[PDB]
Design a protein around this ligand. Structure first.
Ligand SMILES: CCCc1cc(-c2cc(C(=O)N(C)C)cc(C(F)(F)F)c2)nc(C=N)n1
Length: 215
């Protein structure tokens, strides 16, 4: 495992999306992970459907939140997830309307990173690619992030309330970080991205609910 890795520079990461006024972070985290595996497997980079997940993952709560593991299971069981174009994002939950002709990827299971183990998350990112992670994104400091390696004393490892994508890791001006793709649009943070403190006692719970899909 290298000391720094950025899957964006390998072409594994799609443009930053905007979940709008719906608690579908978990769907965007899940599709980001699937996108990265799809590129690694097939050589194609393309947008998969978070709406497909929002409407059809019965184990999750749609715009009221959900888990990525339940998303990956849905895709496996369903034997497919649609492309964005085949099931576009509307930011509100509707009846499940999966379209077999628009299938753009499959899932053959998922694996979880041992809870709170940032070394294991690092190795997982280096060996697989982008990994779905859950964090405490509830602080005002998080909302108005612009630059630097995000750390706040008041972040809560036990309050996982937001889901994002770990697309890499490294170090900036002495400070180790995770490279995190968010889903609040390109005009949030640093072009839709945030660097979050790494190996600082599992800050914001970043390694407490990490998972990736198999393909
Ligand atoms: C008003 C915020 C609603 C909301 C909730 C969640 C959310 C809720 C839960 C959780 O506790 N359960 C039970 C699924 C868990 C998670 C995570 F990432 F840890 F798996 C996220 N995500 C978003 C993302 N936008 N929005």
């Amino acid at each position: 495992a290298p000391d720094s890795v950025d899957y964006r520079k390998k072409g594994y990461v799609t443009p930053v999306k905007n979940q709008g006024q719906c608690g579908s972070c978990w769907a965007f985290s899940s599709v980001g992970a699937l996108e990265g595996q799809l590129k690694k497997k097939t050589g194609k980079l393309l947008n998969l459907s978070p709406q497909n997940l929002v409407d059809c993952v019965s184990e999750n709560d749609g715009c009221g939140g959900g888990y990525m593991t339940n998303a990956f299971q849905y895709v496996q069981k369903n034997r497919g997830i649609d492309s964005e174009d085949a099931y576009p994002y509307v930011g509100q939950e509707e009846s499940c309307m999966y379209n077999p002709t628009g299938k753009a990827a499959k899932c053959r299971g998922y694996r979880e990173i041992p809870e709170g183990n940032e070394k294991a998350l690092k190795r997982a990112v280096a060996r697989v690619g982008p990994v779905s992670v859950a964090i405490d994104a509830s602080l005002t400091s998080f909302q108005f992030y612009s630059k630097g390696v995000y750390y706040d004393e008041s972040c809560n490892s036990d309050n996982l309330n937001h889901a994002v994508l770990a697309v890499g890791y490294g170090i900036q001006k002495g400070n180790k970080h995770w490279i995190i793709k968010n889903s609040w649009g390109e005009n949030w943070g640093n072009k839709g991205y945030i660097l979050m403190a790494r190996n600082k006692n599992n800050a914001c719970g970043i390694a407490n609910l990490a998972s990736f899909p198999k393909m």
